Amino acid sequence: AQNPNCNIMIFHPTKEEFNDFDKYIAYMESQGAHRAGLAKIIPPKEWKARETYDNISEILIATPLQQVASGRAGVFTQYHKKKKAMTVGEYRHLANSKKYQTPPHQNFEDLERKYWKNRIYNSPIYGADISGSLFDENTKQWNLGHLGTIQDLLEKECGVVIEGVNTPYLYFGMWKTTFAWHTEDMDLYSINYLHLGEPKTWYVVPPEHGQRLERLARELFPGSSRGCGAFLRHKVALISPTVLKENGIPFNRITQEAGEFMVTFPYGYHAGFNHGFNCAEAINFATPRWIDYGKMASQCSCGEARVTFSMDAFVRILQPERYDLWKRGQD
Numbered sequence: 459a460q461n462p463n464c465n466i467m468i469f470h471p472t473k474e475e476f477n478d479f480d481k482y483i484a485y486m487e488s489q490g491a492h493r494a495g496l497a498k499i500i501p502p503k504e505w506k507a508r509e510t511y512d513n514i515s516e517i518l519i520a521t522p523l524q525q526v527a528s529g530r531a532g533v534f535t536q537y538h539k540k541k542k543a544m545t546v547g548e549y550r551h552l553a554n555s556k557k558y559q560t561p562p563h564q565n566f567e568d569l570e571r572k573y574w575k576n577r578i579y580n581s582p583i584y585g586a587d588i589s590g591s592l593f594d595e596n597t598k599q600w601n602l603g604h605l606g607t608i609q610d611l612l613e614k615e616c617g618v619v620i621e622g623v624n625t626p627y628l629y630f631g632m633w634k635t636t637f638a639w640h641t642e643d644m645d646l647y648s649i650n651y652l653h654l655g656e657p658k659t660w661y662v663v664p665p666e667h668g669q670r671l672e673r674l675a676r677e678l679f680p681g682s683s684r685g686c687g688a689f690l691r692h693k694v695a696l697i698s699p700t701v702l703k704e705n706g707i708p709f710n711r712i713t714q715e716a717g718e719f720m721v722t723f724p725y726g727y728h729a730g731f732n733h734g735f736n737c738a739e740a741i742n743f744a745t746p747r748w749i750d751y752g753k754m755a756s757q758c759s760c761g762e763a764r765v766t767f768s769m770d771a772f773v774r775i776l777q778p779e780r781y782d783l784w785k786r787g788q789d
């Protein structure tokens with residue numbers, strides 16, 4: 459078995475190997491990358507996402523989200539308070555202000571320490587979940603707006619044609635902005651490109667051990683667990699590496715820098731934080747190997763998770779028994 463310790467693997471494809479996206483994902487899996495839940499892909503030196511980032515300031519963040527924490531430093535939830543719209547230039551200036559800017563630090567490990575010590579005492583503002591793309595239309599390789607769609611994959615594997623679309627999302631971050639512990643909708647893959655700015659630190663649980671994280675989460679968030687049998691789908695709970703280690707949960711960590719891709723694999727729980735002002739683009743995708751995970755994915759039916767239009771068909775075709783209850787949750 460390849461990668462039996464489930465370490466995060468880092469890949470350096472050549473420009474030739476960067477042509478065929480599906481083929482390269484399958485290669486990475488042949489080497490055991492999926493066992494970690496997360497892999498890093500450093501693009502060939504010849505590649506670029508677009509020519510410059512000099513003209514992005516007028517993108518609108520219609521609903522910036524202030525991420526307010528509750529709990530203790532290593533075990534907390536966050537809720538998202540909606541703020542007034544602002545442009546990316548306005549958000550960048552806010553990220554760089556004395557109130558929100560990254561503190562002085564020695565290195566990524568020192569910054570990580572400071573994040574876990576102090577996150578809960580601040581409420582950073584995240585420009586998350588903005589439909590759009592920063593890839594130039596002429597970028598032919600690993601262009602996250604030009605990937606094969608999940609609907610087409612389902613149709614190719616299973617023969618059933620379904621409605622829905624699959625487009626990317628932009629994330630404008632600042633110091634301490636946080637992504638809570640989650641797997642993707644329908645335990646899909648994700649791919650995330652850090653276009654510019656400061657790093658993003660990731661934590662990940664191997665897919666084979668995901669249920670250990672779920673059992674811990676039920677213990678640490680006991681009211682949430684009574685409310686919903688899949689409350690991590692709400693994407694609000696944080697648990698620190700120190701608490702994971704104290705509870706014997708297997709995990710790994712890695713820091714993504716500008717110019718790098720990350721791939722999350724089906725049922726790979728992940729969480730993390732931004733170091734400072736940055737912009738990432740991410741999208742879900744599927745492969746043949748996903749289908750079995752999609753059929754088994756948990757679902758939130760309490761009403762909280764509320765998701766895209768395109769998840770309807772995935773539930774309806776892959777999980778017909780669950781469909782009625784899940785759809786009630788959506789309505």
Ligand SMILES: O=C(O)CNC(=O)C(=O)O
Nearest residue numbers: 629637648649650738740
């Ligand atoms: O970058 C973020 O805030 C969150 N991203 C992801 O969870 C992902 O790409 O799968």
Ligand SMILES: [Mg+2]
Nearest residue numbers: 514515516517
């Ligand atoms: Mg602009």
Ligand code: NI
Nearest residue numbers: 641642648722
């Ligand atoms: Ni994710």
Ligand SMILES: [Zn+2]
Nearest residue numbers: 686758760762
């Ligand atoms: Zn729920």
